[PDB]
Design a protein around this nucleic acid. Structure first.
Ligand code: FES
Ligand SMILES: [Mg+2]
Ligand SMILES: [Mg+2]
Ligand SMILES: [Mg+2]
Ligand SMILES: [Mg+2]
Ligand SMILES: [Mg+2]
Ligand SMILES: [Mg+2]
Ligand SMILES: [Mg+2]
Lengths: 96, 54, 99, 137, 85, 122
RNA sequence: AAACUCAGUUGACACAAAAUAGACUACGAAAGUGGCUUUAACAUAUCUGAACACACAAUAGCUAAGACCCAAACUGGGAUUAGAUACCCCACUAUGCUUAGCCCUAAACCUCAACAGUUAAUCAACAAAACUGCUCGCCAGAACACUACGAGCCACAGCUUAAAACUCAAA
């Protein structure tokens, strides 16, 4: 017909998906450091997914691991462990 | 990002029971709400205390 | 002996350019308000950019400038909208003059 | 170093010293800002009582207690009582969201005492002890 | 059963207790503790709690979309270029 | 199946800790567990003041016992751990490595919900 | 106002309830299910099908035995009012919880049946766009009537099924 006609194909310019920071990584109830990275420093409240940026699956896993650690004695409940205050900040929160 | 409205409302073809029950349609209006509408109390208390003690 | 419309579309510069995201284009200041330059860059819609605080006087009608395109047309669908609302203008970053 | 809002880590080599005393050593000021009443009790690092005050003790009656003015009066009274005990720097630990929540601190300051930290401790039950039924007015 | 003076604790900088208290109130408000206490004062029956949560979610959706539209159209607040037509 | 016993033991001397670990692993084996590994997470301050057997504890030694046991032995092991005084706390969980990292290609975008209302004009 | 001499710090301390996550929309047939661990476990088909049986069925309620922090009909007191058998305040009981049986009702509503399919030429109004095929269930003016009688039921001031007479031109 005509060589210049468009050819059916997937978008070659499609950008890779923004995999959540924890995607492809094993969340564990013993990694109290990583679990504390996703709680409020002052109230120990688990941050919502809008703050954490995590996918749904990883947010659910983080929440369950936090609960497991808190109830099994690996993590504090009412506050972030002080030793992990200076850990990298991955939550889009701003109190001050 | 805005919370997903997919499958939230009660509609035909939606197997799940409603997640949201908006008393008003979730359609943007063409207007925004009007801007909704005791100082010196410490100074008053200080002056009144000075009066009390003098 | 006539080039097909498909041929012209395939071999036109706008088609040559891939996604407009962050591409560099050469625009022309076709209309200026006090501090708002309306720059045409060959796309369907022009962009609007504030006159830079530096060398702002150097920008004038027909002054050829360099832009970094963020979107050929600024549009978006809104809660309840049946069709996308468009502001009928491209979103581009003004980098400076070109010589 | 630029100011850090977090309290000093317990049992750690902290440099901060208020009159040469460590943060765990600074006395405490427990403020209970009930809805209608406010109470202030100053205790030592070993929770030894130092002073007490409240809207009722300062003399405000019935609705007058649950007011910022009464809270400031109670704060001033508690600060004055603690000053005779020698309290200078205090860590405020306020529980409750009564009208006197902040006026208590303001009066505790006007009485002379200096505050080094504010620690909200309002009892928030994760869940338990069902509260009373809602009021219909 | 927790270590005291670590949770919900703010160190007042240079004695500005006003600023320290405002920052603490901001922290508690962002964490939602203030609203939690205010609602927990009186029991919120489960049906009423569900209705309030639904209303809050709908309000959040509408307000976020309206803010998105406002920001998207802000650029069009410029002065009219075609004045006289 | 495969379990991990997360154990918080009273912070005590090396001989006592070794004796308690031997006792716990022996109980596991007697109940039928095939102990796979034993890793010590060190002694640390507990996140909160645990009170076990009327005795309050602020510090404890954290240990993990990875093992395979019949499903029926888990309840008996839990009961024995509870009855053991030297154990501040102990929880048998399904070993995390028995779970898989099923692919999650990313955060797929959720398009704005469409056709949620009739197109009636007002 | 009545009411308690009890109130604050710290420590020990449940058979009650289960912040944040949750801006997630998942599980279950429905009712329902959002603290943690483990065990068992989430029917079938590449259809529909029960006052015609079997099994479930929130909350409330009944019988018996326990628990009882808190809440709480009822009850008492305080206040209010012309009166207040209520709204507001305080105390407390059944009850809310556990065990074993009953009871089988909800605006049990997403008031939108199951399965399959379509978006094509639309659609009383509103609501959650309009329909096609197929099957079951149900309805034939309002009120009498979640009623009477009969029948069945661990139900005994009950539940399911459920009329008619008289009346009206409306509902
Ligand atoms: S984005 Fe892939 S696991 Fe979350
Ligand atoms: Mg069938
Ligand atoms: Mg049936
Ligand atoms: Mg029932
Ligand atoms: Mg009782
Ligand atoms: Mg009935
Ligand atoms: Mg009947
Ligand atoms: Mg009968």
């Amino acid at each position: 017909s005509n060589e210049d006609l468009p050819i059916s194909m997937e978008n070659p310019y499609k950008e890779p998906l923004k995999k959540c920071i924890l995607c492809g990584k094993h969340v564990d109830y013993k990694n109290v450091q990583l679990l504390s990275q996703f709680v409020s420093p002052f109230t120990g409240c688990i941050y919502g997914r809008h703050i954490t940026g995590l996918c749904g699956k990883k947010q659910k896993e983080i929440t369950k691991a936090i609960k497991r650690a808190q109830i099994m004695g690996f993590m504090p409940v009412t506050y972030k462990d002080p030793a992990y205050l200076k850990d990298p900040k991955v939550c889009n929160i701003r109190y001050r | 990002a805005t919370p997903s409205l997919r499958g939230r409302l009660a509609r035909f073809g939606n197997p799940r029971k409603p997640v949201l029950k908006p008393n008003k349609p979730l359609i943007l209006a063409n207007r925004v709400g009007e801007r909704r509408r005791a100082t010196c109390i410490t100074e008053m208390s200080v002056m009144m205390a000075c009066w009390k003690q003098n | 002996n006539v080039e097909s419309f498909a041929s012209m579309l395939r071999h036109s510069p706008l088609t040559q350019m891939g996604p407009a995201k962050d591409k560099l284009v050469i625009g022309r200041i076709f209309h200026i308000v006090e501090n708002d330059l309306y720059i045409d860059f060959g796309g369907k819609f022009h962009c609007v950019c504030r006159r830079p605080e530096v060398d702002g006087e150097k920008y004038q009608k027909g002054t050829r400038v360099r832009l970094r395109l963020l979107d050929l047309e600024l549009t978006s669908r809104f809660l309840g909208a049946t069709t996308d609302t468009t502001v009928l203008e491209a979103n581009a970053v003004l980098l400076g003059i070109q010589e | 170093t630029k100011f850090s809002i977090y309290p000093p880590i317990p049992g750690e080599e902290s440099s901060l010293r208020w009159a040469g005393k460590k943060f765990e050593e600074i006395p405490i000021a427990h403020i209970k800002a009930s809805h209608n009443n406010t109470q202030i009790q100053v205790v030592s690092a070993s929770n030894e009582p130092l002073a007490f005050a409240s809207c009722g003790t300062e003399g405000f009656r019935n609705a007058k207690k649950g007011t910022g003015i009464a809270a400031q009066t109670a704060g001033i009274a508690a600060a004055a009582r603690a000053k005779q005990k020698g309290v200078i720097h205090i860590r405020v630990v306020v529980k409750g969201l009564g009208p006197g929540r902040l006026s208590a601190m303001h009066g505790l300051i006007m009485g002379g005492l200096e505050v080094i930290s504010i620690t909200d401790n309002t009892p928030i039950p994760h869940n338990g002890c069902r509260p009373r039924k809602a009021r219909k007015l | 059963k927790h270590l005291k003076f670590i949770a919900r604790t703010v160190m007042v900088q240079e004695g500005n207790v006003e600023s320290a208290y405002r920052t603490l109130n901001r922290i508690l408000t962002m964490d939602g503790l203030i609203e939690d206490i205010k609602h927990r004062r009186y029991y919120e029956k489960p049906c009423r709690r569900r209705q309030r949560e639904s209303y809050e979610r709908c309000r959040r959706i509408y307000n976020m979309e309206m803010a998105r539209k406002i920001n998207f159209l802000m650029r069009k607040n410029r002065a009219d270029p075609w004045q006289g037509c | 199946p495969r379990y991990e016993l997360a154990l918080i033991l009273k912070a005590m001397q090396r001989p006592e800790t070794a004796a308690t670990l031997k006792r716990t692993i022996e109980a596991l084996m007697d109940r039928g567990a095939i102990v796979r590994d034993l890793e010590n997470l060190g002694e640390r301050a507990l996140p909160y003041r645990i009170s076990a057997h009327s005795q309050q504890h602020n510090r404890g030694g954290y240990f993990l016992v990875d093992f395979y046991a019949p499903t029926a032995a888990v309840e008996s092991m839990v009961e024995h751990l509870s009855r053991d005084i030297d154990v501040i706390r102990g929880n048998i969980v399904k070993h995390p490595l028995t779970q898989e990292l099923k692919e999650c290609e990313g955060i797929v975008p959720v398009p704005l919900a469409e056709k949620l209302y009739s197109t009636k004009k007002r």
